[PDB]
Amino acid sequence: MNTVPFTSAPIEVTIGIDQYSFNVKENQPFHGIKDIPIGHVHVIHFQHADNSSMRYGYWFDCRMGNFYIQYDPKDGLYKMMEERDGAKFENIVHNFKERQMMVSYPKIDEDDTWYNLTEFVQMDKIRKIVRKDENQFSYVDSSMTTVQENELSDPAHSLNYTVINFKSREAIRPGHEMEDFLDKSYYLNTVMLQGIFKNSSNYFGELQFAFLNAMFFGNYGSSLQWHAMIELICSSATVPKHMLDKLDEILYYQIKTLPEQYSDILLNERVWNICLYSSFQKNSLHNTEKIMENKYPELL
Amino acid sequence: GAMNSSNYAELFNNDIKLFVDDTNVYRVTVHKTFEGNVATKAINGCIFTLNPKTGHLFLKIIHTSVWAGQKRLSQLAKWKTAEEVSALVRSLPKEEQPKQIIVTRKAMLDPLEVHMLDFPNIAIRPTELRLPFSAAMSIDKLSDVVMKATEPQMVLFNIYDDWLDRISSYTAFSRLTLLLRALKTNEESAKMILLSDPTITIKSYHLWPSFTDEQWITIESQMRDLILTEYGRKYNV
Numbered sequence: 001m002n003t004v005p006f007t008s009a010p011i012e013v014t015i016g017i018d019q020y021s022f023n024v025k026e027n028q029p030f031h032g033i034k035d036i037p038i039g040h041v042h043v044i045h046f047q048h049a050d051n052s053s054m055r056y057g058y059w060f061d062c063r064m065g066n067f068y069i070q071y072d073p074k075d076g077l078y079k080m081m082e083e084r085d086g087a088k089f090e091n092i093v094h095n096f097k098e099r100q101m102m103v104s105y106p107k108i109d110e111d112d113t114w115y116n117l118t119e120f121v122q123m124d125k126i127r128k129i130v131r132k133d134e135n136q137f138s139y140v141d142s143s144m145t146t147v148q149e150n151e152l153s154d155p156a157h158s159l160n161y162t163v164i165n166f167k168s169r170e171a172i173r174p175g176h177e178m179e180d181f182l183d184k185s186y187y188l189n190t191v192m193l194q195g196i197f198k199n200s201s202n203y204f205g206e207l208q209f210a211f212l213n214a215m216f217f218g219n220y221g222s223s224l225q226w227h228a229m230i231e232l233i234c235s236s237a238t239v240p241k242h243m244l245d246k247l248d249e250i251l252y253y254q255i256k257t258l259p260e261q262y263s264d265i266l267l268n269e270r271v272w273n274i275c276l277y278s279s280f281q282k283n284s285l286h287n288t289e290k291i292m293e294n295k296y297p298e299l300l
Numbered sequence: 301g302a303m304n305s306s307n308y309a310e311l312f313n314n315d316i317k318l319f320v321d322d323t324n325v326y327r328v329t330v331h332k333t334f335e336g337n338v339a340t341k342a343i344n345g346c347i348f349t350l351n352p353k354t355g356h357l358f359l360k361i362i363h364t365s366v367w368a369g370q371k372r373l374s375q376l377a378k379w380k381t382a383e384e385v386s387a388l389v390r391s392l393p394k395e396e397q398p399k400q401i402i403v404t405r406k407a408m409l410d411p412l413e414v415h416m417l418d419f420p421n422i423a424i425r426p427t428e429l430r431l432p433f434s435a436a437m438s439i440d441k442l443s444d445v446v447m448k449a450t451e452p453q454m455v456l457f458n459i460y461d462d463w464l465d466r467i468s469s470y471t472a473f474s475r476l477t478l479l480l481r482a483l484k485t486n487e488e489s490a491k492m493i494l495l496s497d498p499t500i501t502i503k504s505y506h507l508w509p510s511f512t513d514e515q516w517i518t519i520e521s522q523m524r525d526l527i528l529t530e531y532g533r534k535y536n537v
């Protein structure tokens with residue numbers, strides 16, 4: 001179980017760690033988060049009390065280094081940094097733990113929620129969507145645009161998700177126009193899975209990462225990406241059975257975790273009605289359809 | 301975006317454009333079977349692709365063989381239309397290709413956009429105008445060439461005959477749409493108006509009768525009356 005210490009908390013802020021969150025008051029004696037489960041990526045995220053504009057946060061994996069948070073009064077945010085001196089770090093953490101100045105990652109033992117939301121998410125793939133190679137962790141915020149959004153403007157601050165566009169030459173084989181548009185299996189299986197992602201695990205990892213950035217930062221382009229990746233599967237007549245069964249599990253836990261009060265902005269009516277009731281896979285997502293019908297029957 | 305009453309003069313500027321109407325591509329007669337069920341029999345159809353500035357009509361005849369062994373024909377018909385319009389554009393010299401294609405029905409947008417991916421600079425546009433191009437098969441010479449076709453065929457016409465020698469393309473389009481609206485509202489009466497007088501004939505190389513300017517004013521007035529009349533007979537006013 002690993003630790004992300006904080007130097008201090010000089011401004012009042014709501015701090016999230018994965019699906020948990022807690023309020024820290026201005027200059028409250030808070031010095032970080034302990035007992036963080038090893039084996040998963042994690043995200044630590046921030047919303048300032050005095051300017052709820054800009055949720056921002058950091059994706060990290062404690063196996064890759066010793067990370068801490070330190071407020072920067074010039075740039076006005078909590079920054080993640082790597083401490084390269086291992087003994088300094090261990091000594092800092094031990095002092096903060098002894099004085100009980102840390103909150104504990106509050107995982108219930110029965111609870112697989114975070115695993116289920118990050119099953120296919122790997123730090124190395126995050127670092128290719130979010131390009132900042134000098135750091136082992138990745139910054140994301142509410143306002144960052146995607147490569148596809150910029151095509152339709154600062155490239156260094158972009159989310160480089162895989163571009164999916166149903167009316168593009170990549171998606172449509174010459175001479176198979178009607179076939180490929182109405183049944184997207186060749187775009188899903190040949191272009192995307194075999195060609196670009198290499199396997200369904202990487203596809204699901206990017207789908208899960210897009211959802212998490214949408215939910216935790218209200219990142220609109222991430223929400224577009226999540227829905228596009230769902231629709232590309234649902235609109236394919238030919239999908240491996242193991243992918244359909246896994247997708248149902250993935251979406252079930254995403255829908256289960258979504259704040260009830262954010263459904264209006266985080267869920268696209270057209271995509272979900274099409275996926276659950278019109279598409280080739282309308283009868284392949286039993287768990288997802290049941291939770292959607294019982295939790296968000298208005299959207300449908 | 302969409303073409304409407306506000307931007308109507310754009311049809312007659314010098315940017316090449318085509319209307320595409322697909323309402324006569326897939327045509328059927330509905331009938332009873334020996335067992336008392338219902339079945340359809342396809343008949344030949346046509347894509348109506350018109351340059352409104354010049355009157356050039358690219359009439360692609362859709363022979364019933366294209367439907368053989370196919371399912372969901374009303375959906376296929378939109379994609380076949382888009383395939384044939386794309387093929388027409390590719391056949392034209394670059395300087396003759398349209399800058400815009402206006403589809404008369406919104407269900408043609410995605411099929412045509414997908415078939416024209418290779419032409420990103422050709423705008424595919426809907427229209428809010430309710431244009432009467434379905435009545436094209438009420439023009440006797442167009443109906444005749446469609447029904448006689450034994451194979452897929454493209455036939456080129458000028459739907460304005462020689463009118464552009466005397467009137468502008470705005471006036472010619474207005475006359476065409478009035479004629480077609482009348483034929484659509486009451487075909488028998490419209491055709492009576494157009495042909496009642498045996499001394500005014502249709503030239504071999506034309507579609508409509510050889511009316512003088514004054515006779516066209518009379519004809520146009522009679523067509524408006526018909527449309528108002530039928531509007532009367534319909535709503536009881």
Ligand SMILES: CCCOC(=O)[C@H](C)Sc1nnc(N)s1
Nearest residue numbers: 471472474475476477478520524
């Ligand atoms: C020189 C055009 C001849 O045809 C027409 O004018 C059509 C009937 S449309 C129309 N606009 N305004 C009217 N009152 S009737």
